[PDB]
Amino acid sequence: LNGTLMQYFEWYMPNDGQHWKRLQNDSAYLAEHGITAVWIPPAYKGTSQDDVGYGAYDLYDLGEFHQKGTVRTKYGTKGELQSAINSLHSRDINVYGDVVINHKGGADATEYVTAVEVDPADRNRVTSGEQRIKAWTHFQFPGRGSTYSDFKWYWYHFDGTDWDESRKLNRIYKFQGKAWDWEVSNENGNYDYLMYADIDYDHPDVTAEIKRWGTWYANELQLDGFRLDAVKHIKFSFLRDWVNHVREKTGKEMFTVAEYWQNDLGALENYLNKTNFNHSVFDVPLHYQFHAASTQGGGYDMRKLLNGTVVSKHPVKAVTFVDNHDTQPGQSLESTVQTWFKPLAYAFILTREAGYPQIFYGDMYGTKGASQREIPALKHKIEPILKARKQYAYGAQHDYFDHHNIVGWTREGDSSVANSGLAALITDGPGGTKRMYVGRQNAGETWHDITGNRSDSVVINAEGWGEFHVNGGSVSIYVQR
Ligand SMILES: OC[C@H]1O[C@@H]2O[C@H]3[C@H](O)[C@@H](O)[C@@H](O[C@H]4[C@H](O)[C@@H](O)[C@@H](O[C@H]5[C@H](O)[C@@H](O)[C@@H](O[C@H]6[C@H](O)[C@@H](O)[C@@H](O[C@H]7[C@H](O)[C@@H](O)[C@@H](O[C@H]8[C@H](O)[C@@H](O)[C@@H](O[C@H]1[C@H](O)[C@H]2O)O[C@@H]8CO)O[C@@H]7CO)O[C@@H]6CO)O[C@@H]5CO)O[C@@H]4CO)O[C@@H]3CO
Ligand SMILES: [Ca+2]
Ligand SMILES: [Ca+2]
Ligand code: NA
Ligand code: NA
């Protein structure tokens, strides 16, 4: 009954074209461990075969056309993806597609464009007169032709770019007659511009086309929902309308979660408000708290985990997580939750009632970057916690955030899930004990630590309390034997 998301990729997976096949072959394992939805990496042609997917060359090429030196994407072919999705749906696993509509990379040809430079710390400030640049803005899709869509892109569909090919120069250029979109993040004055050619969401043909593509994409892959990339760089009212549009055309719920990357609840709440709460956001602040706790050696006040997060104020609109492809070692938003703390963070997201939790492929299977700082495979430490969620994390919750280090929570169980109920303890410092209430209805049951970290059994007293133990820097989750 509890739903669990999985981000089904990490940044450094090998470019062998086998990822979709792997996903298909992992569907039985995912279903058995209680994963009910997967977020798949962008499925369309990037700027090269080894693009992780955020280049977004051709949104209508799902690994079907020979473009950018390849038919397949990094991950495989359209057919392979569709076979994987078909296996996942056969096991009631929903599929959320990644939607990268901020920009387009890898244009087929340059165009001469009149532009001005803007200040990278304040993109509202113009720092040059008009100049002629060669911008990568012409998309003809020579390998695709007009199959699925005859829409061609030119400079006038974009607000700007970060490269002039004539002078070989990396600067933020705003095209003549264009204005950065609003509302976007107010960081750097206006954070519309991120990378590649920035899509102009003031352009009515562009808004129409991206909405149309949205519906096509959903149908083509039989998607159940969306993950929205880089939303702080995309006109908020457009995103709102886009989500409503695809829902209207497909007739389905299309659960949607946006990646709004800011460690600030206020900014996330503004975004929710400006999109009428029609979709969820990732709980970025909670991730940063996990990161802080993991790097402070016991010095973090664990009571802080209850405040300043999306899940603390808008639990129905939070997707909670520990790490992702941007926070993993080496990557652009690097803030990795250290290995020792990572299971404790997973207990917090998986066994508490608030939020829609997500597990990271990189945490399960490890990351394959070229460093000696990669995330090791933690599948065996995470499996028990997933099981706790799937089978035990039901009913009324009681919180025990009453200590700088050792914090815990219980779940009473629900009569709809047989033998459900748990008692969780995590500590960033020394271990110890906490007496916690698990419900009088559990009186006399014998509970054991599903993680195997503690070998002691705890018998629940007549008043519904047990005396629970946790080791130093560890997690224990007690459930009925
Ligand atoms: O697994 C489901 C769910 O579990 C967790 O949610 C629990 C939550 O943490 C608790 O706080 C409590 O919820 C109470 C809530 O917090 C109170 O605010 C109140 O809610 C009332 C609303 O205030 C009121 O507005 C109205 O709500 C309606 C919505 O406005 C309307 O949009 C629609 O809701 C839909 C969502 O918008 C949509 O996103 C989708 O929701 C899914 C979540 O996005 C997804 O994360 C997950 O939710 C988790 C949640 O994250 C945990 O925190 O699955 C959701 C279901 O698919 O779909 C929604 C439904 O279509 O409709 C609602 C009302 O129908 O009314 C509500 C009261 O009904 O009281 C709440 C107590 O009921 O308990 C929940 C449940 O465990
Ligand atoms: Ca933008
Ligand atoms: Ca614009
Ligand atoms: Na723009
Ligand atoms: Na602490």
Side-chain angles (χ1 to χ4, degrees):
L1 194 141
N2 280 328
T4 304
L5 234 172
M6 184 164 175
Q7 171 178 5
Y8 207 85
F9 66 107
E10 62 93 6
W11 189 267
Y12 298 102
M13 298 187 317
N15 177 30
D16 66 2
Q18 300 313 300
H19 192 57
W20 298 144
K21 282 172 131 59
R22 283 179 189 116
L23 174 56
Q24 183 171 351
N25 294 335
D26 216 15
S27 64
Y29 170 92
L30 296 168
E32 176 51 29
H33 295 262
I35 301 306
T36 54
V38 301
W39 152 31
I40 48 160
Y44 25 79
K45 201 58 57 68
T47 72
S48 63
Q49 193 189 64
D50 73 7
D51 197 316
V52 169
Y54 300 104
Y57 168 69
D58 185 11
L59 301 183
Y60 291 102
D61 177 1
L62 304 172
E64 186 175 351
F65 306 96
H66 198 294
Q67 307 194 118
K68 308 292 155 190
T70 182
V71 178
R72 62 175 186 79
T73 65
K74 184 180 171 178
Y75 304 119
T77 68
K78 187 175 84 173
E80 289 163 357
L81 176 52
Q82 292 173 325
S83 296
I85 290 170
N86 157 292
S87 291
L88 293 161
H89 288 154
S90 73
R91 281 113 167 151
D92 302 317
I93 298 174
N94 280 356
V95 180
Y96 306 156
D98 210 322
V99 172
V100 179
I101 60 178
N102 178 56
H103 55 255
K104 297 181 72 65
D108 302 308
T110 57
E111 287 181 287
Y112 285 98
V113 187
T114 299
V116 301
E117 197 190 330
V118 307
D119 178 344
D122 185 354
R123 289 86 165 283
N124 296 322
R125 281 274 309 256
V126 174
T127 54
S128 78
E130 292 187 323
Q131 49 180 308
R132 206 73 169 149
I133 64 166
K134 264 173 92 163
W136 286 106
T137 55
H138 190 190
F139 295 70
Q140 276 291 307
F141 315 112
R144 182 165 57 79
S146 293
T147 306
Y148 311 129
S149 165
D150 67 11
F151 192 99
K152 306 307 188 184
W153 298 72
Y154 307 90
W155 71 272
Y156 53 71
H157 291 136
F158 302 108
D159 280 326
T161 186
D162 64 349
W163 186 261
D164 170 25
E165 189 68 13
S166 65
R167 298 175 186 74
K168 313 280 170 52
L169 201 43
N170 172 235
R171 297 295 187 284
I172 302 175
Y173 296 100
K174 184 180 75 194
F175 300 156
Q176 189 177 47
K178 303 305 200 173
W180 301 123
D181 301 336
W182 188 252
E183 183 175 357
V184 295
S185 169
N186 66 41
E187 294 180 329
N188 302 129
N190 167 296
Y191 217 163
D192 193 18
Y193 189 78
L194 176 67
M195 58 185 52
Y196 314 101
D198 191 68
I199 291 167
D200 181 11
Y201 287 108
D202 302 312
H203 200 299
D205 297 334
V206 167
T207 56
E209 172 50 32
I210 296 301
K211 289 168 179 180
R212 188 272 216 192
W213 167 80
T215 307
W216 179 88
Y217 183 48
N219 291 336
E220 202 66 22
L221 299 184
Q222 303 285 293
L223 299 179
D224 308 286
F226 297 114
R227 181 267 193 186
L228 308 185
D229 184 56
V231 298
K232 79 175 180 175
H233 309 287
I234 303 171
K235 180 177 197 147
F236 304 164
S237 65
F238 172 70
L239 290 171
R240 179 198 61 202
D241 293 345
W242 187 87
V243 171
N244 286 339
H245 177 96
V246 179
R247 285 167 181 172
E248 196 255 313
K249 297 301 189 160
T250 65
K252 295 157 67 55
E253 186 196 342
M254 308 303 288
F255 175 88
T256 295
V257 55
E259 176 252 323
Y260 193 109
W261 198 269
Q262 197 161 333
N263 184 19
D264 181 67
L265 176 57
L268 294 162
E269 288 180 325
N270 175 56
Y271 175 85
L272 290 169
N273 180 48
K274 295 292 167 59
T275 56
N276 290 336
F277 292 79
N278 75 2
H279 66 271
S280 300
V281 288
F282 288 111
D283 198 343
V284 175
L286 179 65
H287 158 76
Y288 279 102
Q289 291 207 46
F290 294 150
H291 171 261
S294 77
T295 51
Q296 290 178 32
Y300 193 78
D301 182 1
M302 292 283 285
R303 295 175 249 119
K304 289 168 172 186
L305 297 169
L306 301 189
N307 305 125
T309 58
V310 185
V311 74
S312 69
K313 293 293 134 200
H314 304 282
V316 184
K317 298 285 163 176
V319 175
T320 50
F321 70 106
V322 185
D323 272 303
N324 71 15
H325 69 291
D326 296 323
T327 67
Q328 72 177 97
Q331 281 305 303
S332 59
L333 304 174
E334 187 188 62
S335 46
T336 303
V337 179
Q338 302 302 284
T339 311
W340 72 271
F341 190 84
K342 177 151 277 166
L344 289 55
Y346 274 115
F348 191 95
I349 72 169
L350 293 173
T351 67
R352 298 177 55 73
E353 65 84 15
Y356 183 177
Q358 173 180 278
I359 288 172
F360 181 38
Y361 181 107
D363 296 341
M364 293 290 284
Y365 307 137
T367 59
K368 303 184 158 168
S371 80
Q372 306 300 315
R373 311 187 192 235
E374 303 302 313
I375 301 169
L378 294 169
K379 176 171 87 204
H380 298 316
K381 294 185 195 155
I382 296 167
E383 277 168 352
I385 308 176
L386 267 171
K387 188 174 190 211
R389 183 176 174 77
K390 193 201 188 176
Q391 298 178 35
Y392 295 104
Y394 300 91
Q397 180 163 304
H398 305 277
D399 283 351
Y400 296 87
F401 287 69
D402 51 8
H403 195 272
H404 195 258
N405 305 338
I406 302 165
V407 298
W409 57 91
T410 61
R411 305 292 295 283
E412 292 191 22
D414 189 276
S415 61
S416 78
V417 184
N419 309 115
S420 58
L422 61 83
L425 280 174
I426 62 178
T427 177
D428 67 341
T433 71
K434 204 187 300 292
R435 297 184 65 80
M436 291 183 299
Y437 177 71
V438 297
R440 275 168 305 277
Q441 69 274 34
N442 294 310
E445 294 175 4
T446 306
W447 286 23
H448 77 119
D449 179 5
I450 205 179
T451 68
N453 287 330
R454 295 290 302 196
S455 57
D456 47 281
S457 334
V458 177
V459 174
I460 305 310
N461 76 17
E463 302 77 24
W465 292 75
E467 195 169 89
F468 299 105
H469 301 248
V470 67
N471 293 322
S474 194
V475 51
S476 296
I477 305 168
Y478 293 84
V479 299
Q480 189 181 15
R481 283 197 184 288

